[PDB]
Amino acid sequence: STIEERVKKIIGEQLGVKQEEVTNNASFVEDLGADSLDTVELVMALEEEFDTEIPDEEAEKITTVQAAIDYINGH
Amino acid sequence: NIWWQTKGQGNVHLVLLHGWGLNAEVWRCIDEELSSHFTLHLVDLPGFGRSRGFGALSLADMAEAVLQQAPDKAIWLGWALGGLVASQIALTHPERVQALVTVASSPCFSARDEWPGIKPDVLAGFQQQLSDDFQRTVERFLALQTMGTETARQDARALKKTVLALPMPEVDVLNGGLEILKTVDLRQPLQNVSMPFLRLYGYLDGLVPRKVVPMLDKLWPHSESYIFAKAAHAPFISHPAEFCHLLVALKQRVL
C-alpha cells in the first residue's frame, strides 16, 4: 500500500471518484470539481492519513494529485 | 432526559447552549477559563449529545425542555441554533435570564427580502445531502464553520473531535433542527427584551452574514454587538481569550 495509492484513495474518497480512475495529473478544482470546501477537507485528510502537519504555504500549492504525492513522499 | 453539567466557582451563573449538529463538548476550549469567573451550566440540546429522550421539536418545545432543570437565574449564552433557544427563553421567561448573549447567531437564519441570511434553496440542498450522504455532509459543515480563518484547519479538527466525542444525533433530530433554522424569525419579538442583550459575531461567518449586524443594531437599539474581525462561525474556538474577556466584562454590567 504505497504513498501514491494512499494519496489516490484519499482523493477518491474525498471527491467521490473511484480511485482506479484517478490520474496523477488530475487537478482538484479543474478536473475533479472540488471547491474551496473540498480542498480544505482534502488537505486535512492527507495530514490525518500521513500523520503530518502541512503549513498553509505548502497546502496552497497542492492543487493536483501529483503535488500531493510529491509533498507527502519527501516527508 | 436533558444532560446538564454544572462546574466552576463563579458568583454569576452562565448557561452555555451549543449549535446545530454538536454538543456541550464544543465548550471545552474555553470552559476552564470561564469556570474561574462563573458557575457554568452546560447543556446538550434535546436530541443532541447525551440528551436522547427526544425527536424533532419546535423551538418552543426545545426551549421548555431545556428550561426544566436550568438554574433559577443565569446569563444565557446561545451559539448559533443555541442562540435561538436562548432568545426564546429570554422572551417567554425573562425572569430566569439575567442577560441574553448570542454568538454567531441570527434571529432569522434564512434570507428574506432586504434580509441577509441563508438562501432557502441552499438550506434545502443541505437538508438533502444530509438525508443522502450524512457524514460527508456533517463533515463539510464543520469545515464550512471555520473557512477563511487563520486557524481554519485546527479549529475544524477541534469541532470534529466534539462530534467524535459522542454518538451522532438521529437524522430526525438533525432534520428538526434545520426546520427551526428555516422557519423561526425572532426579529420583531426581540425588540421587547429588556434584560442586557449582547450579540457576538464573526466577521467571516458565512452562515450569519455580517450585514445583519448594523441592521440589528438599528432594530434592537437597546442591544449591543461585537464583531470578531478574524473569526468565522466559532469565534470562541478561534479567539478563546478575546471571547472570555468579553463575557467577563459583561458579568460586571449584570452586577
Ligand SMILES: *OP(=O)(O)OCC(C)(C)[C@H](O)C(=O)NCCC(=O)NCCSC(=O)CCCCCC(=O)OC
Ligand atoms: O471554498 P470556496 O470555493 O470559496 O467555496 C465556498 C462555497 C462554494 C462552499 C460557498 O461558501 C458556498 O457554497 N456557500 C453556501 C454554503 C452555505 O451557506 N450553506 C448553508 C447550509 S445550511 C447549514 O449549513 C446548516 C445550518 C447552520 C447551522 C446553524 C447552527 O446552529 O450552527 C452550528
